[PDB]
Ligand binder design. Structure first.
Ligand SMILES: CC(C)=CCC/C(C)=C/CC/C(C)=C/CC/C(C)=C/COP(=O)(O)OP(=O)(O)O
Ligand SMILES: CC(C)=CCC/C(C)=C/CC/C(C)=C/CC/C(C)=C/COP(=O)(O)OP(=O)(O)O
Ligand SMILES: [Mg+2]
Ligand SMILES: [Mg+2]
Ligand SMILES: [Mg+2]
Ligand SMILES: [Mg+2]
Lengths: 312, 314
């Protein structure tokens, strides 16, 4: 009687979800929102909108979509990379646990997917925005997948610089392209697509990220992670090309230690500085990429300041 | 200059991805594919199609979408639940690592999303299909979120039976409704919606999953997990209501040990058998839910099915 009646009412209604339940699942996400950098991504979307011209509130939704995807991808990335810190603050999984952090990050990817339907009610356009969203999230995961595979199967595969760049086009290029492609699709206005420029921005951003992780130290957490970062990939291929067997193996040994020992981390930085000159090689490489934009007098890529502060 | 030429070529082309790359990152997923269950899920989809009549090619895609979703959900649930085994086999994260397993499962959620486009060439219907897919994946994550939070922050929140059933309507009900709603949306045909029946199947499935995890032991891994299972929720509320302070606290202590000790697990199960009578309560609750369908002569919930209902665990 009463039990069957309560069951019948339950199965005939939509699943129950409260604002309190929403606050509970949002805790790991709210924690990363404390991290700085929002001002900066906001600025890049604003500046690109000088070309695209989306109306303010449509731009607001693109921005929210991008923020959810970026933050969620970093919450998961930190679990994948066993990262203890992100922008100087403790990572969410060390506070709320890996289980809630993964579930919340995933939930926010689906909340971002839902916000796409609010960019437009035109069916054909909507289909195109969801396809952009789906394609670039697929690319991001393919790229992350390779980054993780090389790291976790090392020394099975040592990537070449070309392989690394293709991984970055997928991994870091994904959200850069997603944000821009959504904006170019919604533009009510503009010229050649800016996807090439934004691919270049993504490459520069990732090589700089990998470089600064080591250069600031010289926490160099990337060494503890065992990551096949741009300078590491240069150093492994360089020692291999030169027949520098012992040095090649010592770089591999230190990466495989997954060490937090400052003195050992410093020894790998010494190899990269004195033996392969990989940090200077990387500095020069980022400069060359940046100059491709600085000297784009014919605006083949462009439609300064952002590019220089790209790391934040 | 050759550097510029190469960078220019790279940024002017789609990102490079090979079939070898695809194979290497699919490892965690290929491994769970070795587990049984596929035939059973295909059987429930087949029976419901006797009502929905989708053409075979189209039913095949629905089935592929749901399978990718189901499998990716389990890869991730096992990481969340620190599970060593799934269907008698070692779980993927123990073999390939949590990093690859999480990324591959999430990749497969997006591959499933991609497959929705192959169900129709009509934009208005497509939007509906994507909405269904999005809504039920949101529900699944909301339910999973409560299940995890209650367990990992215990005793912050002791859920009631009512709370547990709402978490299940979200968690377990999510994929059952996703499959059924995609089918009802694509039907070219068929009576009242089967959503209420599918919600009941989800609840029966989950409470039976919880019950059997303890009754086949009586490896009771749910105790090691610390899960707020249907019998554990009944025991915790029964003890509080009855003033069994020590037993209420002992249930919490055992759940918090995250123990693999078989005798500590058996002590808890026997507290549920004899002190709170949670096992009998759960068996009876399951039977009552199943009878709501077996005694549905007017076909108010119902549109073979009964066979699936008794083998729902598979
Ligand atoms: C293009 C426009 C208009 C705006 C940009 C909008 C966004 C979201 C920019 C940021 C995109 C971004 C930085 C994506 C990469 C996120 C990712 C997958 C990180 C994980 O890779 P790691 O190499 O582990 O990164 P960390 O070094 O931070 O741990
Ligand atoms: C409705 C039709 C036609 C078919 C059904 C098709 C499917 C996919 C059925 C199964 C759906 C199902 C059982 C989903 C639950 C997946 C999930 C979120 C599991 C995680 O929860 P736990 O409670 O940890 O489960 P375990 O006990 O298996 O670890
Ligand atoms: Mg990282
Ligand atoms: Mg990473
Ligand atoms: Mg589980
Ligand atoms: Mg679970």
């Amino acid at each position: 009687n009463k039990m069957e009646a309560k069951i019948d009412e339950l199965i005939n209604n939509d699943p129950v979800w409260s604002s309190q339940n929403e606050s509970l699942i949002s805790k790991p996400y709210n924690h990363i929102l404390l991290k700085p950098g929002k001002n900066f991504r906001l600025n890049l979307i604003v500046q690109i909108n000088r070309v695209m011209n989306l109306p303010k509130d449509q731009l607001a939704i693109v921005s929210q979509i991008v923020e959810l995807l970026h933050n969620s991808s970093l919450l998961i990335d930190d679990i994948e990379d066993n990262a203890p810190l992100r922008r100087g603050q403790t990572t969410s999984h060390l506070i709320f646990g890996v289980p809630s952090t993964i579930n919340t990050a995933n939930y926010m990817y689906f909340r971002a997917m839902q916000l796409v339907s609010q960019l437009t009610t035109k069916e054909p356009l909507y289909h195109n925005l969801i396809t952009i969203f789906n394609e670039e999230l697929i690319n991001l995961h393919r790229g992350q997948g390779l980054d993780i595979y090389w790291r976790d199967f090392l020394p099975e595969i040592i990537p070449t610089q070309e392989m690394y760049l293709n991984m970055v086009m997928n991994k870091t290029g994904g959200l850069f392209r997603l944000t821009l492609r959504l904006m170019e699709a919604l533009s009510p206005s503009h010229g050649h697509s800016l996807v090439p420029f934004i691919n270049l921005l993504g490459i520069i951003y990732q090589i700089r990220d990998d470089y600064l992780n080591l250069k600031d130290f010289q926490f160099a957490e990337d060494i503890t992670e065992g990551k096949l970062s741009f300078p590491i990939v240069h150093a492994l291929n360089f020692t291999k090309t030169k027949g520098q067997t012992e040095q090649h193996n010592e770089i591999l040994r230190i990466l495989l230690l997954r060490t937090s020992d400052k003195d050992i981390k410093l020894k790998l930085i010494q190899i990269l500085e004195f033996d392969t000159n990989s940090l200077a090689y990387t500095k020069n490489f980022i400069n060359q990429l940046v100059n491709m934009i600085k000297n784009d007098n014919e605006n083949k890529y462009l439609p300064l300041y952002i590019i220089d502060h790209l790391s934040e």
